[PDB]
Assembly symmetry: C2
Homo-oligomer: 223 residues x 2
């Protein structure tokens, strides 16, 4: 019952769920990433869904990639199929999920007889920084988050800026409202560190939003 | 019934999959090992991280396991990645070397899993007849120059291999690491792969080389 699988999307919440699972002495048998063909997927994220391989390699944990069209409800089922093929007793995911996701996750879990573990934005983000998380902003979609944020690493100064934007424009500290997206380059659990060698940011002025596409990165020893 | 196919992305891996499907096996997973040991006698390493693109074309879940390449960790690292799968057996390419076969049979036996394994000139001609679109991404044998990197293995190319087999004894099927390949298209593939950017890296010190596929995308068919 300690054998679990963590739904991993590469961001700060997925990596914290993983941190959490291991710290609570759970046995994360697999990292599971769903690769949706549809960009507007309601269940899964597409951002850096191809870079998870790097994090999995840095972690040493087996990675399971499932491929789906990303259609409304057909998605939950696709996950179900992938999960039923794994020898696990439970599944972990980031607590920042939504009632829509949370509900559907719990649904498939009950259909497979699996437990569902889901572990203040300010104390949260600060906790991640104190745990050694190296979070890089790879997406922005909210007034106050200009293109300059793309690719920036979230430290204490950065967090203080977000605080200011929160007071001025109601920007959620931890991006709970989807103000920005992230990708974890390093964390104490990573055996190696992810180093971005080349990347480009795609910007859309029609909605004043953008993303940092990492198109070249490697791993570096940590000792 | 339920099995996992050891998939490296090469011709033999792809034929193992084709073989398993046609023989009424239920391919629940494709398993790709990623090793840091560029010169391992266990796994094909060139473009090892490209299987994701093929798996996406097939519509079959992929399991990526990792290993530093230490020969003393070959069995335990592969075992770690298979032990957690609800499978009754595993499929391996029919051309797996003895060095490989032993390791595979050991890990299988330790997991209680079965091992399913499917004339070089005949074997190759069949793959072409089956519609396999094979690109050479690595070579290492006297007689094989850099011109082979990136080349598409068609009937014309096969005859050249047969010729080289006569002249320098090069293995027509590439066993023993003589050459490595990458399957761009196959019948089971829903989409075909197209290479958009690649880098040829030649090793003069051993007169060998490899093609690093840098960019690629799926195209309709
Ligand atoms: N593509 C995906 N594949 C598998 N699990 C996913 C995927 N996307 C999200 N999840 C899981 O569901 C949770 C909710 O993700 P959500 O869409 O809210 O974005 P997020 O919280 O920013 O993602 P991340 O955990 O990477 O930070 C994640 O914490 C993770 O466990
Ligand atoms: N990285 C790997 N991960 C999982 N299985 C592998 C890996 N490398 C080899 N194998 C398995 O062992 C067999 C032998 O590998 P080999 O390199 O000879 O063939 P291949 O990779 O399938 O095709 P080719 O040699 O033409 O590139 C494969 O058929 C496959 O089943």
């Amino acid at each position: 019952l300690a054998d679990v699988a963590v739904l991993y999307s590469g961001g700060k919440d997925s990596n914290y769920a993983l941190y959490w699972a291991i710290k609570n002495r759970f046995s994360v048998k697999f990292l599971v990433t769903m690769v949706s063909e549809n960009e507007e997927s309601y269940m899964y994220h597409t951002i850096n869904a191809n870079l998870t391989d790097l994090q999995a390699r840095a972690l040493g944990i087996p990675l399971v990639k499932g491929f789906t069209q990303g259609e409304k409800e057909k998605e939950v089922e696709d996950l179900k199929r992938v999960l039923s093929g794994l020898k696990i007793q439970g599944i972990v995911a980031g607590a920042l999920a939504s009632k829509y996701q949370r509900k559907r996750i719990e649904k498939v879990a009950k259909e497979l007889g699996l437990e569902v573990y889901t572990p203040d934005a300010k104390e949260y983000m600060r906790e991640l920084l104190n745990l050694g998380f190296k979070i890089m902003v790879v997406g922005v979609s909210a007034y106050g988050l200009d293109e300059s944020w793309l690719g920036r690493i979230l430290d204490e100064s950065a967090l203080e800026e977000l605080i200011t934007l929160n007071e001025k424009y109601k920007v959620h500290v931890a991006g709970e409202g989807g103000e920005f997206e992230t990708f974890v380059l390093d964390m104490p659990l990573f055996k190696y560190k992810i180093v971005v060698d080349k990347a480009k940011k795609v910007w859309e002025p029609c909605t004043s939003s953008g993303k940092l596409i990492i198109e070249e990165a490697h791993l570096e020893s940590k000792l």
